[PDB]
């Protein structure tokens, strides 16, 4: 499968309406056109994405996309894939002050909520109606941040330290001593989410009054149990939903950072540069081994250059179904940044993935052999030998 790609253009902020307020984003269907404000003669370069959302004009019906529209397009499908037994991921991307935090979290005190609220709402619903005597469900929640290449836990704030990142030989990278908690109702995950959002590090800059200072990962471990007398698969599916809110790239001149803010921006830009390098390469290699021919000699994707790409090794490639939501600003002054996001989004369209359903390998072999026995028995019986 391929990485799903959604782009979303936002309205003006105070900074842009105070200064020049000319838009450069135009959009139609699933096509997004950028126009260079410095070169009106040049071609209006256009990009094709799997989804495109226009939140510039609130009351208009001209392809306006509220929070719900984005959710029904992306998150509902990803939760359906989660019930199918697949690990899924949705991660935000773009520059500072574009909409990552809003899209993933939104404002709780409104009818305008983020992907994570509506996803957990719909999940709690679906487990509630589909509960049965034999069918049962369990869900656990965790929430971590990467501040200065140091992993911190959000749910439990008293930890006050940097956890250790380990590598399971089969399951890949993980975080040790991560306070995964069991929840039973939507009020519980709401309380956890509010505590986590209060725990995150946020500082005010010129580009954004509440600019994020750390990448954030919200992990939901979901398990379906189907117990019956005969041999029905017990604790069959175990899926992981990974909802990732990245901090945005910054420029020191426009941001006005000094001291700690500038160092935070430098670390954020380092992590984002490593992420961009990894995205470009997963892309080229896949596309090649895919189009080129099929040598598959050797391609090295630098996952280890940063902790962010290290933790998300399985989501950016390998065993996961992943979606990339890019945020875009309309202002002309931000043009050189916005195009860059779009360019990387285009490369994200090329990346592929290889996800498969989880099970006990002994039970996997037993089921496969039983199916082979059944097929051979049917073949022999049809031909008069069995």
């Amino acid at each position: 499968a391929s990485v799903k790609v959604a782009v979303r253009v936002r309205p003006f902020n105070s900074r842009e309406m105070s200064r020049d307020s000319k838009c450069i984003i135009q959009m139609s269907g699933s096509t997004t056109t950028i126009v260079n404000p410095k070169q009106p003669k040049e071609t209006p370069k256009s990009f094709s994405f799997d989804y495109s959302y226009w939140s510039h004009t609130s009351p208009e019906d001209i392809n306006y996309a509220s929070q719900k529209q984005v959710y029904r397009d992306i998150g509902e499908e990803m939760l359906q894939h989660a019930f199918e037994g697949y690990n899924v991921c949705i991660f935000a991307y773009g520059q500072t002050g574009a909409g990552k935090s809003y899209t993933m979290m939104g404002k709780q005190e409104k009818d305008q909520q983020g992907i994570i609220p509506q996803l957990c709402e719909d999940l709690f619903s679906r487990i509630n109606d589909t509960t049965n005597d034999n069918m049962s469900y369990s869900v656990e929640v965790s929430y971590m941040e990467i501040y200065c290449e140091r992993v911190r836990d959000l749910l439990n704030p008293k930890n006050k330290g940097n956890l250790r990142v380990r590598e399971h030989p089969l399951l890949g990278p993980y975080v040790e001593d991560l306070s995964k908690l069991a929840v039973t109702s939507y009020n519980d995950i709401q309380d956890l989410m509010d505590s986590g959002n209060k725990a995150r590090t946020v500082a005010a800059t010129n580009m954004n009054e509440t600019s994020s200072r750390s990448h954030a990962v919200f992990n939901i471990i979901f398990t379906q149990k189907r117990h019956d007398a005969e041999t029905n698969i017990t604790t069959e599916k175990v899926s992981k939903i990974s909802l990732v809110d990245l901090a945005g790239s910054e420029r020191a001149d426009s941001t006005g950072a000094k001291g700690t803010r500038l160092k935070e921006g430098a670390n954020i830009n380092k992590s984002l540069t490593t992420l961009g390098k990894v995205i470009s390469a997963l892309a080229e290699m896949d596309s090649g081994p895919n189009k080129n021919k099929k040598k598959k000699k050797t391609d090295f994707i630098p996952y280890r250059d940063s902790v962010l790409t290290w933790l998300l090794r399985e989501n950016l490639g390998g065993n996961s179904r992943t979606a990339m939501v890019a945020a875009l600003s309309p202002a002309d002054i931000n043009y050189d940044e916005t195009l860059s996001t779009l360019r990387y989004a285009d490369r994200a369209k090329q990346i592929r993935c290889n996800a498969v359903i989880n099970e006990d390998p002994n039970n996997k072999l037993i089921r496969e052999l039983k199916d082979e026995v059944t097929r051979l028995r049917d073949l022999l019986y049809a031909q008069g030998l069995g």
């Binding site: 040598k295 598959k296 000699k297 050797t298």
Partner: protein, 451 residues
């Protein structure tokens, strides 16, 4: 303060201790009466090395040794001999009969009422110590005391102290020559304790030492004094690394870390290379290569077993004297290219190397020449299984008819214990046969996915 506590049990232990303490007293400049004139003449120094000797206020040096026996004879020979004023008067000798070549008599019946005193005095010696490193236990397989009482003492020490290393030097029964009709019973009984409660057991065989004395030192009629002196030289070579300076020092923990792959395989062989007479010390260079090669010669081994019938799992070479690293490296490289010396494929490195500046000393009235260089090799290998298997056969030949068994049951054992010990021995032997096997061909059977 790299301090060690020596324990000598039985006749063989006490006599080896006499040789060892003669050597230690001569190395450090200590007189038989405990005084050291070197410090008085010089005015002070570190020559009262705390590894073996404890210094009192008056300038006397009392050894950190514990002698134990059930016969008054062997230690009454020491209480009235040359070294009567060196040892503390408390010598832990039960004024009763002896174990009588009986494991049961020394473990269950008479080993009690002497064990408590022994552990009390060991506690007193250990309390005086700072940074105690381990114990060195000298005893003999095939004897009553040296097997049974050593078993009991090792069990109690492992209960009390726990983490301290316990090295063991012991005299294994020979293939052909023997001094008792009931050696195999005692050896097979005490293997069950030395396997669990020790950390590293060095075994020596008297037939091998007699052959070395006949061939190298040209002694036609040796006695136990010569064998004890050789064993003393070996123990001094082992312990020199924590008494004198050197280019590379090897402590007692590095020993166990490098020579013991698995917990149940801690039975290495020991050899000493420049064993030569004074007359033949001339006409010979005695370089590093010569002694390193002589360590690997089967004729020079101290246990009657051929290393060519097995595989080397670890080697530790301890050099003394005018030795430099480059010759050691050249010798190791030369040895690695010989086809007759085989190493297990799961140990590519193989060698541990230690160097000490202090050359070996000469005991007056001895038989070893004065040399500038020396090496002691310790080799954990699989050939040792042969040395056990013979004994097992002997045990069977007596246990099919239950000969000499009623003496053991009369002293507080039951029959089944014998069987238990024998079974343990088989398991240990099996383990050796499993660790010398080459790794299965391309250990992950085979492999080679796409690209």
């Amino acid at each position: 303060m790299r301090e060690c506590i020596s324990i000598h049990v039985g006749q063989a232990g006490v006599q080896i201790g006499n040789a060892c303490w003669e050597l230690y007293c001569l190395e450090h400049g200590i007189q038989p009466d405990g005084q050291m004139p070197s410090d008085k003449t010089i005015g002070g120094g570190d020559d009262s090395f705390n590894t073996f000797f404890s210094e009192t206020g008056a300038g006397k040096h009392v050894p950190r040794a514990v002698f134990v026996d059930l016969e008054p004879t062997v230690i009454d020979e020491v209480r009235t001999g040359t070294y009567r004023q060196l040892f503390h008067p408390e010598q832990l000798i039960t004024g009763k009969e002896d174990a009588a070549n009986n494991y049961a008599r020394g473990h269950y019946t008479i080993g009690k009422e002497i064990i408590d005193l022994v552990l009390d005095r060991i506690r007193k010696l250990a309390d005086q110590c700072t940074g105690l490193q381990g114990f060195l236990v000298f005893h003999s397989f095939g004897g009553g005391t040296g097997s049974g009482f050593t078993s009991l003492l090792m069990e109690r020490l492992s209960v009390d102290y726990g983490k301290k290393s316990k090295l063991e030097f012991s005299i294994y029964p020979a293939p052909q020559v023997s001094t008792a009709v009931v050696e195999p019973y005692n050896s097979i009984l005490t293997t069950h304790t030395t396997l669990e409660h020790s950390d590293c057991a060095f075994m020596v065989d008297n037939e091998a030492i007699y052959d070395i004395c006949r061939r190298n030192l040209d002694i036609e009629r040796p006695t136990y004094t010569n064998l004890n002196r050789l064993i003393s030289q070996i123990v001094s070579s082992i312990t020199a690394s924590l008494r004198f300076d050197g280019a590379l020092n090897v402590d007692l923990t590095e020993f166990q870390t490098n020579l013991v792959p698995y917990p149940r395989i801690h039975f290495p062989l020991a050899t000493y290379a420049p064993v030569i007479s004074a007359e033949k010390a001339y006409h010979e260079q005695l370089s590093v290569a010569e002694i390193t090669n002589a360590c690997f010669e089967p004729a020079n081994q101290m246990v009657k077993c051929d290393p060519r019938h097995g595989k080397y799992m670890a080697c530790c070479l301890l050099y003394r004297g005018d030795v430099v690293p480059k010759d050691v490296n050249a010798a190791i490289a030369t040895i690695k290219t010989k086809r007759s010396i085989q190493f297990v494929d799961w140990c590519p490195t193989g060698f541990k190397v230690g160097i000490n500046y202090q050359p070996p000393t000469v005991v007056p009235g001895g038989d070893l020449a004065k040399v500038q260089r020396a090496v002691c090799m310790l080799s954990n290998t699989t050939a040792i299984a042969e040395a056990w298997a013979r004994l097992d056969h002997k045990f069977d030949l007596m246990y099919a008819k239950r000969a000499f068994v009623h003496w053991y049951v009369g002293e507080g054992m039951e029959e089944g214990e014998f069987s238990e010990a024998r079974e343990d021995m088989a398991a240990l032997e099996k383990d050796y046969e499993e660790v010398g096997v080459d790794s299965v061909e391309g250990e992950g059977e085979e492999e080679g996915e796409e690209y």
